[PDB]
Design an enzyme around this catalytic site. Structure first.
Site, mmCIF file in Angstrom:
data_model
loop_
_atom_site.group_PDB
_atom_site.id
_atom_site.type_symbol
_atom_site.label_atom_id
_atom_site.label_comp_id
_atom_site.label_asym_id
_atom_site.label_seq_id
_atom_site.Cartn_x
_atom_site.Cartn_y
_atom_site.Cartn_z
ATOM 1 N N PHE A 138 -9.043 -0.225 2.579
ATOM 2 C CA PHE A 138 -7.967 0.370 1.800
ATOM 3 C C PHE A 138 -7.691 -0.375 0.507
ATOM 4 O O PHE A 138 -6.589 -0.258 -0.040
ATOM 5 C CB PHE A 138 -6.705 0.447 2.652
ATOM 6 N N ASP A 139 -8.661 -1.118 -0.016
ATOM 7 C CA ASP A 139 -8.469 -1.887 -1.236
ATOM 8 C C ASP A 139 -8.787 -1.085 -2.489
ATOM 9 O O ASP A 139 -9.153 -1.675 -3.509
ATOM 10 C CB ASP A 139 -9.319 -3.160 -1.207
ATOM 11 N N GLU A 144 -5.967 -4.177 6.801
ATOM 12 C CA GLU A 144 -7.172 -4.037 5.992
ATOM 13 C C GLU A 144 -6.832 -3.956 4.506
ATOM 14 O O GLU A 144 -7.151 -2.989 3.815
ATOM 15 C CB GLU A 144 -7.973 -2.813 6.436
ATOM 16 N N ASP A 145 -6.176 -5.001 4.020
ATOM 17 C CA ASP A 145 -5.842 -5.115 2.606
ATOM 18 C C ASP A 145 -5.034 -3.910 2.133
ATOM 19 O O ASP A 145 -5.338 -3.287 1.116
ATOM 20 C CB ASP A 145 -7.104 -5.287 1.765
ATOM 21 N N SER A 146 -4.001 -3.575 2.894
ATOM 22 C CA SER A 146 -2.976 -2.652 2.445
ATOM 23 C C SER A 146 -1.636 -3.308 2.729
ATOM 24 O O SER A 146 -1.479 -4.016 3.723
ATOM 25 C CB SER A 146 -3.082 -1.296 3.141
#
Ligand SMILES: [Mg+2]
Ligand SMILES: [Zn+2]
Ligand SMILES: [Zn+2]
Ligand SMILES: [Zn+2]
Lengths: 47, 113, 49, 263, 45, 66, 137
Positions: free
Chosen positions: C47-48, G1-3
């Site tokens: 989600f980056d 996850e990088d959110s």
RNA sequence: UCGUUGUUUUUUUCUG
């Protein structure tokens, strides 16, 4: 309807007292864009 | 662009009732309450109270999705009492508790100042 | 496009056949696609951005 | 049964002790105070003319955040449901500001004080921008140079913090219980020991430390909360407390009415 | 009938779409249309 | 660009305190002392008065269009 | 996850809120000593192939004044090119991008190197941080 | 009075 493209305000509803301009006037339901945010909303011809 | 309005979170639209009740067939004397325009602020408070009563077997709820401001509450009291009666009893008890707290705090503030 | 409709869903690059499956639609507000965190693995997606 | 013991009080803040109530109750009170305590704030700005170096939206936003004395807002109807076409004087308050710098030099500083109530459902004590003191000019709105003028005609309405953070009357609500962790709701991360690395809460004195030989108690429940309250000045802390309580009470009353009316 | 403004002298004037595009008073060659008279609104949010 | 109105984190009003903060600074008091005297305890606020960069005065230095 | 979850009230108080400026550039094109291109509001009768949007926000001089609101598919500049041989005019407008909205901020009007009328329009708007945006330490 | 059309060509700096 020759009454398009003229500034119109709203009197009842959740957007009471906001300025706007008619965009589409198919009939019985006017879609007037709101000047404050970048959005458009519908509203019947009575309000 | 696709943002939901902030005034939709609490101003319940007319077509949908504030509170909707359903029965839970899988077990007896159990109902499922579908609330609207509410969140933990009320659900948790009601649950804590209802859990304390002796005649309540199962009380539960869950905020299904934060982007939607509503929650559902599952309640099943033993056969002695219909769940709705327990619910209104809890509401009344909490109202009384709050009134008592307000009275006490008013007194305390008055003497304090 | 209403609820429960089946719609394909892909990520580029599509290395292996798991890189694109058919999901069930659930309309929600705001302007991002949303996924169950589990199904990223086959997509090798994060989600980056 | 519920008990209160105010510790230190003041117009803007309160540091009180509340015990003998469900943790859920205190936490819900905190949330309701932070969220559902209606107040009054700016909600429509019409710039009749601007020449500052600040984007119109910038000034509109800055105005939106300024705290207003909303003492009697309870008595103002919601503009959404008010019957009057447009806004009557009983569903809104109108504030106007127009400050202009003159002279080739210097720099004017438009302050929150310059806002001036024009209408409003008098004599209700609402609308006036809050001031710390007698001389406190208030917030800084903008700076103006030569030949720069500003003319705005604001509007205020009664709204809840849920809709937007500008209606929040509470600044920050402290909260805590069991400073000694006797309930063991937390395990303390540590390198050597839990005590000699962890600073103690400022309420450590108010409760006896657990005895060394004491055994864990499992039927004990949280019973004392040490919550502080602060406000922006738009409402008196005690008024906020009472108003949150009233809001919770009436919401529960609405729920009960719906339940009984379902039949 | 359309209002205007200069970038150096800052003195208003107007044109009839026929005058050469220059400042009437200081002869400068840059001009901006002045602010409209209609009203502006903002949610202040 | 200009001092913010409220502390994003909590909400405590800080905008009006900029002038006083500067004033306390000119007379030699260290930043920590100045923040203390303003009664800014929660660092969620302190970060702002401590780390605001003022730019509007830079903008003013341009001769206005009008 | 990088959110990352961001406080909503921080946004409401203007955290990471930002401006946005877009500029549109256009000028008269000289297709002949006697044949040039003009800035003006076209009329449906006198012109052909007009844009699907609306021209109402245009002035009588062919431009849009600052401080007015605009949106997607809104003709912000009216330019008409003479048709090489009435009804001898064709549109050369500069409609706003269908996916952008804002408030007209400052219109610049002058002469290009060649003495033809030279225009520029700068719309501005504010971008509110929201879901889907990007941030990085 | 439905109808109602909007360039290519390269190069560039970027995103995963
Ligand atoms: Mg990636
Ligand atoms: Zn009214
Ligand atoms: Zn000039
Ligand atoms: Zn803070």
């Amino acid at each position: 309807d020759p009454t398009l493209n003229k500034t119109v305000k709203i009197r009842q509803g959740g957007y009471k007292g906001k300025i706007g301009i008619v965009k589409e006037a198919n009939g019985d339901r006017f879609r007037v864009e709101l000047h404050n945010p970048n959005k458009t909303i519908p509203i019947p011809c009575s309000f | 662009m696709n943002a939901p309005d902030r005034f939709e979170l609490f101003i319940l639209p007319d077509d949908v009732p504030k509170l909707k009740i359903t029965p839970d067939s899988r077990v007896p004397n159990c109902i499922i309450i579908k609330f609207e325009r509410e969140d933990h602020t009320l659900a948790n408070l009601l649950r804590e109270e209802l859990a304390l009563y002796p005649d309540v077997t199962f009380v539960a709820y869950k905020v299904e999705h934060p982007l939607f401001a509503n929650f559902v509450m599952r309640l099943q009291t033993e056969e002695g009492t219909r769940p709705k009666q327990a619910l209104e009893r809890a509401c009344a008890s909490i109202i009384n508790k709050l009134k008592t707290l307000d009275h006490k705090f008013n007194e305390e503030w008055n003497i304090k100042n | 496009l209403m609820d429960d409709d089946p719609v394909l869903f892909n990520r580029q690059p599509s290395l292996h056949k798991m890189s694109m499956m058919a999901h069930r639609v659930k309309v929600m507000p705001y302007s991002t696609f949303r996924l169950n965190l589990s199904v990223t693995s086959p997509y090798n997606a994060d989600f980056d951005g | 049964e519920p008990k209160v013991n105010i510790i230190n009080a003041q117009d803007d803040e309160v540091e009180l002790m509340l015990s003998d109530v469900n943790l859920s109750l205190a936490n819900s009170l905190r949330r309701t105070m932070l969220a559902e305590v209606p107040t009054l704030a700016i909600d429509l700005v019409e710039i009749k003319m601007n020449t500052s170096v600040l984007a119109d939206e910038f000034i509109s936003h800055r105005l939106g955040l300024i705290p207003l004395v909303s003492e009697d807002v309870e008595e103002m109807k919601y503009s959404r449901d008010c019957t009057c076409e447009d806004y009557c004087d009983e569903c809104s308050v109108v504030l106007e500001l127009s400050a202009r710098h003159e002279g080739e030099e210097g720099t004017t500083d438009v302050y929150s004080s310059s806002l001036i109530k024009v209408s409003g459902p008098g004599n209700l004590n609402v609308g006036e921008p809050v001031r710390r003191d007698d001389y406190d000019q208030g917030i800084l709105l903008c700076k103006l140079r030569n030949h720069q003028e500003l003319n705005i005609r604001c509007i205020a309405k009664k709204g809840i913090a849920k809709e937007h953070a500008k209606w929040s009357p509470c600044s920050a609500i402290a909260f805590e219980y069991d400073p000694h962790n006797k309930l063991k709701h937390t395990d303390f991360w540590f390198e050597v020991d839990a005590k000699k690395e962890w600073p103690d809460s400022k309420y450590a004195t108010w409760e006896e430390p657990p005895k060394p030989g004491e055994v864990f108690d499992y039927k004990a429940k949280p019973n004392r909360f040490y919550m502080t309250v602060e406000t922006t000045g738009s409402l008196k802390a005690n008024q906020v407390f009472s108003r949150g309580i009233k809001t919770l009470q009436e919401k529960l009353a609405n729920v009960l009415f719906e339940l009984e009316n379902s039949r | 009938g359309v209002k205007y403004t200069c970038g150096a002298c800052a003195h208003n004037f107007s044109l009839n779409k026929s005058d050469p595009v220059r400042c009437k008073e200081c002869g400068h060659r840059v001009i901006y249309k002045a602010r409209t008279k209609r009203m502006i609104q903002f949610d202040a949010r | 660009m200009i001092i913010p109105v409220r502390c994003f984190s909590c909400g405590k009003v800080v905008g009006d305190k900029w002038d006083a903060y500067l004033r306390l600074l000119e007379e030699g008091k260290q930043e920590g002392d100045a923040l203390d005297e303003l009664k800014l305890k929660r660092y969620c606020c302190r970060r702002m008065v401590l780390t605001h960069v003022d730019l509007i005065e830079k903008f003013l230095r341009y001769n206005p269009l009008e | 996850e990088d959110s990352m979850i961001m406080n909503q009230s921080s946004i409401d108080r203007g955290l990471f809120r930002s401006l946005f400026f877009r500029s549109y550039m256009d000028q008269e094109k000289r297709f002949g000593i006697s044949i040039v291109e003009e800035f003006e509001k076209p009329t449906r009768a006198t012109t052909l192939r007009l844009k699907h949007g609306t021209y109402e926000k245009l002035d009588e001089d062919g431009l849009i004044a600052p401080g007015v609101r605009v949106s997607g598919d809104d003709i912000i500049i009216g330019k008409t090119t003479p048709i090489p041989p009435y009804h001898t005019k064709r549109d050369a407008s500069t409609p706003l991008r269908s996916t952008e909205n804002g408030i007209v901020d400052q219109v610049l009007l002058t002469t290009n190197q060649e003495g033809l009328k030279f225009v520029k329009v700068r719309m501005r708007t504010t971008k509110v941080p929201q879901i889907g945006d990007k941030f990085a330490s």
